[PDB]
Design an enzyme around this catalytic site. Structure first.
Site, PDB file in Angstrom:
ATOM      1  N   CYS A   1       0.903  -1.177   0.000  1.00 39.69           N
ATOM      2  CA  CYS A   1       0.000   0.000   0.000  1.00 39.69           C
ATOM      3  C   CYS A   1       0.931   1.214   0.000  1.00 39.69           C
ATOM      4  O   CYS A   1       1.972   1.109  -0.616  1.00 39.69           O
ATOM      5  CB  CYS A   1      -1.066  -0.125   1.083  1.00 39.69           C
ATOM      6  SG  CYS A   1      -0.401  -0.574   2.742  1.00 39.69           S
ATOM      7  N   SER A   2       0.703   2.265   0.782  1.00 40.18           N
ATOM      8  CA  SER A   2       1.750   3.312   0.922  1.00 40.18           C
ATOM      9  C   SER A   2       2.843   2.870   1.914  1.00 40.18           C
ATOM     10  O   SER A   2       4.013   2.854   1.521  1.00 40.18           O
ATOM     11  CB  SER A   2       1.143   4.681   1.294  1.00 40.18           C
ATOM     12  OG  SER A   2       2.134   5.686   1.030  1.00 40.18           O
ATOM     13  N   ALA A   3       2.511   2.560   3.169  1.00 41.85           N
ATOM     14  CA  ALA A   3       3.538   2.130   4.170  1.00 41.85           C
ATOM     15  C   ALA A   3       3.755   0.608   4.186  1.00 41.85           C
ATOM     16  O   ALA A   3       4.796   0.178   4.707  1.00 41.85           O
ATOM     17  CB  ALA A   3       3.185   2.626   5.564  1.00 41.85           C
ATOM     18  N   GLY A   4       2.858  -0.182   3.614  1.00 41.54           N
ATOM     19  CA  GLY A   4       2.925  -1.658   3.606  1.00 41.54           C
ATOM     20  C   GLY A   4       2.606  -2.290   4.976  1.00 41.54           C
ATOM     21  O   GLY A   4       3.173  -3.355   5.231  1.00 41.54           O
ATOM     22  N   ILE A   5       1.732  -1.699   5.766  1.00 41.95           N
ATOM     23  CA  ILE A   5       1.309  -2.292   7.081  1.00 41.95           C
ATOM     24  C   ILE A   5      -0.199  -2.279   7.262  1.00 41.95           C
ATOM     25  O   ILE A   5      -0.706  -3.158   7.979  1.00 41.95           O
ATOM     26  CB  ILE A   5       2.066  -1.606   8.247  1.00 41.95           C
ATOM     27  CG1 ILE A   5       1.761  -0.114   8.402  1.00 41.95           C
ATOM     28  CG2 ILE A   5       3.548  -1.853   8.128  1.00 41.95           C
ATOM     29  CD1 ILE A   5       2.407   0.553   9.626  1.00 41.95           C
ATOM     30  N   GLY A   6      -0.935  -1.296   6.739  1.00 46.09           N
ATOM     31  CA  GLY A   6      -2.358  -1.127   7.058  1.00 46.09           C
ATOM     32  C   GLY A   6      -3.272  -1.941   6.147  1.00 46.09           C
ATOM     33  O   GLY A   6      -3.665  -3.085   6.529  1.00 46.09           O
ATOM     34  N   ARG A   7      -3.600  -1.433   4.946  1.00 41.35           N
ATOM     35  CA  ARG A   7      -4.362  -2.241   3.954  1.00 41.35           C
ATOM     36  C   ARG A   7      -3.639  -3.568   3.672  1.00 41.35           C
ATOM     37  O   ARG A   7      -4.302  -4.633   3.516  1.00 41.35           O
ATOM     38  CB  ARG A   7      -4.543  -1.443   2.659  1.00 41.35           C
ATOM     39  CG  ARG A   7      -5.321  -0.158   2.872  1.00 41.35           C
ATOM     40  CD  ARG A   7      -5.353   0.718   1.643  1.00 41.35           C
ATOM     41  NE  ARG A   7      -5.716   2.073   1.999  1.00 41.35           N
ATOM     42  CZ  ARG A   7      -5.818   3.074   1.110  1.00 41.35           C
ATOM     43  NH1 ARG A   7      -5.461   2.881  -0.160  1.00 41.35           N
ATOM     44  NH2 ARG A   7      -6.159   4.284   1.539  1.00 41.35           N
ATOM     45  N   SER A   8      -2.315  -3.528   3.547  1.00 40.83           N
ATOM     46  CA  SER A   8      -1.471  -4.721   3.257  1.00 40.83           C
ATOM     47  C   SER A   8      -1.692  -5.770   4.362  1.00 40.83           C
ATOM     48  O   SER A   8      -1.784  -6.993   4.053  1.00 40.83           O
ATOM     49  CB  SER A   8      -0.012  -4.328   3.140  1.00 40.83           C
ATOM     50  OG  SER A   8       0.272  -3.600   1.929  1.00 40.83           O
TER      51      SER A   8
ATOM     52  N   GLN B   1      -3.505  -0.695  11.147  1.00 34.49           N
ATOM     53  CA  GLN B   1      -3.056   0.665  11.617  1.00 34.49           C
ATOM     54  C   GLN B   1      -4.123   1.360  12.470  1.00 34.49           C
ATOM     55  O   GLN B   1      -3.754   2.369  13.164  1.00 34.49           O
ATOM     56  CB  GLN B   1      -2.761   1.569  10.417  1.00 34.49           C
ATOM     57  CG  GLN B   1      -1.403   1.329   9.799  1.00 34.49           C
ATOM     58  CD  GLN B   1      -1.157   2.281   8.636  1.00 34.49           C
ATOM     59  OE1 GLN B   1      -1.743   2.169   7.558  1.00 34.49           O
ATOM     60  NE2 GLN B   1      -0.321   3.272   8.863  1.00 34.49           N
TER      61      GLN B   1
END
Ligand SMILES: O=C(c1c(F)cccc1F)N1CCCCCC1
EC number: 3.1.3.48
Length: 284
Positions: A215-222, A262
């Site tokens: 995703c953008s940071a690779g922790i939330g949607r990911s 997140q």
């Protein structure tokens, strides 16, 4: 405890914030010393989101092996995932080096290039068949083969060529294009259908390297994507599907990458996708 019952109990008691903070408190803390070296500052999108040393993906080069990416290895489910940040202007060549070296078949993208009027990741794939991309720093060529645009997602066929050996491979790009700029989807129907299309492709299967998810940071949607996929796979493998504990699966995955899920709203949505996803697979 049947997670649908726990679900209604948390909703009625309005305690999603408290459940989410308990996960934050219990989550693993491992060193990320390579991520914090001064030479790697322009390889990180966010100062507070780094891969642990023990689980980080290494680039095959002696100069600098660093990329903001983690291997999530789920032992009981027999699934692995690479979770990574959206590529930056100076890490698009590293990104495709990683896909090549790890033998991935699929890339799963859960963000738009622009959201909230700001850039969330580089334009890292070609938009026209006749305008391919060359990454001179890693010696790769990337060509758009075909594009299928649907109401909630786009699937692309890409050709990646290692210019050093002239070997080629087909990569599938699964782009979920409708996650809202604020909050989470009101219904988990489009996201679950999307998950089902990635599975049907072979991209998640053991004959290939791990899927790359960002995703953008690779922790939330990911985090939501891998948590939902692993929980559903466990509910089909076990004698007692009601024994699958989403909180315990999320803490296992947080051993491999910090900060997965997140917000309390993302936690609630993760519950909804699994609960509604199980009853669609089981026959219903
Ligand atoms: O209709 C649904 C559905 C559901 F099961 C529960 C709530 C809301 C929904 F929209 N789905 C169709 C495709 C299967 C995977 C997604 C689910």
């Amino acid at each position: 405890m049947e997670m649908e019952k726990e679900f209604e109990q948390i909703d009625k008691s309005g305690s999603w914030a408290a459940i989410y903070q308990d996960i934050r408190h219990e989550a693993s803390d491992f060193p990320s010393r390579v991520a914090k070296l001064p030479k790697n500052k322009n390889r990180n999108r966010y100062r507070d989101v780094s891969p642990f040393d023990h689980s980080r993906i290494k680039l095959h080069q002696e100069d600098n092996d660093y990329i903001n990416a983690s291997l999530i290895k789920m032992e009981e489910a027999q699934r692995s995932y690479i979770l990574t940040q959206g590529p930056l202007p100076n890490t698009v060549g590293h990104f495709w080096e990683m896909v090549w070296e790890q033998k991935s078949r699929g890339v799963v993208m859960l963000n738009r290039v622009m959201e909230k009027g700001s850039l969330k990741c580089a334009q890292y794939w070609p938009q026209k068949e006749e305008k391919e991309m060359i990454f001179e720093d890693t010696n790769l060529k990337l060509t758009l083969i075909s594009e299928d645009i649907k109401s909630y997602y786009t699937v692309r066929q890409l050709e990646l060529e290692n210019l050093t050996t002239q070997e080629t491979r087909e990569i599938l790009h699964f782009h979920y294009t409708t996650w809202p700029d604020f909050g989470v989807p009101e219904s988990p129907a489009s996201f679950l259908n999307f998950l089902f299309k990635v599975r049907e492709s072979g991209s998640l299967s053991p004959e290939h390297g791990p899927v790359v998810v960002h995703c953008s940071a690779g922790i939330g949607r990911s985090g939501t994507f891998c948590l939902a996929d692993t929980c559903l796979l466990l509910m089909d493998k076990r004698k007692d599907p009601s024994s699958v504990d989403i909180k315990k699966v999320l803490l296992e995955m947080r051993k491999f990458r910090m900060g997965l899920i997140q917000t309390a709203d993302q936690l609630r949505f993760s519950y909804l996708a699994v609960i509604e996803g199980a009853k669609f697979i089981m026959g219903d």
